[PDB]
């Protein structure tokens, strides 16, 4: 087969582009962490609703705010049995999300989506107690650096 | 000459294959212009243009490095009579004795080939396959260069019995006659075994001794002369010397074969 004009033009135009991503890895991982009993859609609804409150109270991109929050809160390394060990992206995200979920559960709304969204809004404005947990973990790592 | 080649059009430049053929035509005609090279050693010739046994001099054997023996620290004292002396920490082989033994072994090979016997060229060092194969092909013989299976002679039924055999005329022409299973399963034993590295082929030498197969070998300073029927004192670790001696023996075998064919064609 000899490709015609339109086919070759399409091939060139497309090969000049990268492939779109199937899913946002971080958001999918957070959703799966919210998931229980295989109810993916419930977790997606909860996460999207919380992010929607985050936007409505901050008026900035809430996906970016969530990643700023997870990146800043999550500890880079953690002491384990006592030696420090580094943490990759997923472990850091899991620890940060657990810290987020505790403070969210401490709130008053009967709906978990509202609690989570308001907690993420507070975090995006630099107001959270999980910073203290991160500081304590980092301090312990500094104290036990000698045993690397 | 060069089928399935599509020439190019005159308007367009040469193709890669057209350039290759053009340069080949240049090479076969004009690349060799300006001088003729003389008195220069070319390794391949040692395999393809070996000298006759009577034309060998001590100078030619020394040029091939046949005289260079093993280190004086690895001396096998049973090889005392073949040694001319020691020089630069190694023993020097007496090349007149080498010439005599080599002429005798070449006569043995020529006689065996002229009688229609089976000649086996065994050499298992790294780069010896080419010379072994060429010697076997020009002597209508056989060769081994990968590995000598122990029991190849004393246990021939369990090793070499499965491979096919062939009836041939006085002129080495296939007859294509059907062989009976008993004939196919008999031992076919070499009439002459020549070993290039007898130190690493003790199994073959012992099997030849047990099976009464006369054997030739290159006996270095550290090798046992009495383990072989027709020793050849010389260097066995240099490929040039080994190929020189092997080419001499192979040319003797080829001369014997040619004499046999000439007599059968008269």
């Amino acid at each position: 087969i000899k490709p015609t004009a339109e086919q070759l033009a399409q091939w060139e135009a497309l090969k000049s582009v990268p492939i779109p991503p199937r899913k946002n890895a971080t958001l999918d991982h957070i959703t799966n962490m919210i998931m229980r009993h295989g109810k993916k859609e419930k977790a997606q609804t909860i996460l999207s609703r919380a992010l929607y409150l985050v936007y409505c109270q901050t008026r900035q991109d809430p996906i970016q705010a969530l990643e700023k929050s997870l990146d800043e809160l999550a500890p880079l390394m953690m002491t384990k049995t006592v030696i420090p060990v580094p943490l990759n992206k997923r472990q850091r995200n899991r620890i940060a999300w657990n810290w987020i979920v505790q403070s969210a559960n401490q709130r008053v709304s009967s709906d978990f989506a509202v609690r989570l969204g308001e907690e993420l809004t507070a975090i995006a404005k630099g107001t959270s107690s999980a910073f203290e947990k991160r500081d304590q973990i980092h301090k312990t790592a500094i104290a036990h650096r000698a045993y690397i | 000459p060069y089928p399935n080649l599509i020439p190019s059009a005159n308007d367009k430049p040469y193709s890669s294959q057209e350039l290759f053929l053009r340069q080949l035509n240049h090479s076969m005609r004009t690349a060799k212009l300006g001088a003729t090279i003389s008195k220069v050693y070319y390794p391949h010739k040692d395999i393809f243009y070996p000298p006759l046994p009577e034309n060998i001099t001590v100078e030619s054997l020394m040029s091939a490095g046949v005289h260079l023996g093993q280190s004086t620290s690895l001396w096998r004292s049973s090889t005392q009579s073949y040694i001319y002396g020691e020089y630069k920490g190694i023993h020097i082989i007496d090349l007149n004795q080498t010439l005599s033994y080599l002429k005798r072994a070449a006569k043995v090979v020529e006689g065996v080939s002229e009688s229609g016997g089976i000649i086996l060229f065994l050499g298992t060092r790294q780069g010896q396959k080419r010379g072994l194969e060429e010697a076997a092909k020009k002597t209508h013989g056989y060769y081994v260069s990968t590995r000598w299976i122990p029991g190849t002679l004393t246990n021939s039924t369990e090793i070499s019995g499965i491979w096919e055999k062939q009836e041939i005329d006085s002129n080495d022409n296939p007859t294509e006659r059907a062989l009976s299973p008993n004939e196919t399963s008999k031992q076919v034993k070499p009439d002459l075994l020549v070993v290039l590295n007898p130190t690493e082929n003790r199994n073959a030498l012992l099997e030849a001794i047990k099976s009464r197969v006369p054997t030739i070998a290159i006996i270095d300073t550290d090798s046992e002369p009495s383990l072989v029927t027709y020793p050849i004192p010389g260097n066995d670790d240099s490929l040039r010397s080994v190929n020189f001696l092997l080419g001499v023996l192979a040319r003797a075998g080829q001369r014997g074969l040619q004499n046999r064919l000439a007599r059968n064609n008269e």
Binding site: - | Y14, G34, S38
Partner: protein
């Protein structure tokens, strides 16, 4: 040991030399004396080295890219070129130019016929080659012929060593541009040796060295010698050198 190649009809060439170009004494100078001289010098230069095992053409192809053995290259080049020259003037192995060569000259030289091309080559040799040199008619990879001249001992095969420009005197700005593009072509190659591919081959070779003509034609009148060489070539060899 590089040895002077044996030539067909050597006894006749000793008796008279190449007819209508050289006398016997001149042919002795150009070939029997100069080729022996060059071969002996090459043997002295390359003995005890790898290059004793290679022919002069393979020597010069090997040695073209290394500055410090240019002398060897020079000898090799001459030892090749001289023989090429001799072969196009040998009496025989009258021979006629082939149809293919005439077609290529007609196509290569913008429709010009062979004889005016001969006169143009005479002009080129008179003009650019001041003193010792070589003249060639060469074909490139495009199946196009053209006229090349080398000063002293130069080779047609490798264009870095063509030695077609005499820098002892001035150079035209176009020649400088040609030199600069040539050096860029050399430098572009990724090979450590710096080698480049050149498929040029000599169809015709003429010896402008003083050994060829000085005894038979004097200090001047070299163009007379070139004309005599070109008129009475051995066309069998020239036709064979071309590929079809």
């Amino acid at each position: 040991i590089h040895v002077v190649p044996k030539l067909p009809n050597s006894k006749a060439l000793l008796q008279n030399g190449v007819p209508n170009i050289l006398s016997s004494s001149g042919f002795k100078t150009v070939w029997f004396d100069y080729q022996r001289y060059l071969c002996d010098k090459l043997t002295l230069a390359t003995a005890g080295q790898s290059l004793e095992s290679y022919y002069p053409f393979h020597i010069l192809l090997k040695t073209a890219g290394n500055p410090l053995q240019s002398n060897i290259f020079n000898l090799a080049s001459s030892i090749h070129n001289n023989h090429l020259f001799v072969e196009n003037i040998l009496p025989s192995a009258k021979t006629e130019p082939s149809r293919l060569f005439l077609s290529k000259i007609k196509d290569s030289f913008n429709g010009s016929d062979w004889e005016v091309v001969k006169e143009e080559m005479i002009y080129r040799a008179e003009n650019e080659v001041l003193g010792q040199g070589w003249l060639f008619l060469v074909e490139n990879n495009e199946k196009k012929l053209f006229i090349l001249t080398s000063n002293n001992n130069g080779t047609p095969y490798y264009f870095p060593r063509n030695q077609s420009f005499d820098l002892n005197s001035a150079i035209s700005i176009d020649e400088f541009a040609t030199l600069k593009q040539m050096k860029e072509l050399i430098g572009k190659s990724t090979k450590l040796n710096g080698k480049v591919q050149d498929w040029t081959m000599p169809i015709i070779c003429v010896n402008l060295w003083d050994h060829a003509y000085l005894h038979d034609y004097g200090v001047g009148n070299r163009s007379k010698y070139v004309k005599n060489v070109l008129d009475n070539l051995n066309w069998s060899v020239v036709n064979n050198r071309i590929f079809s």
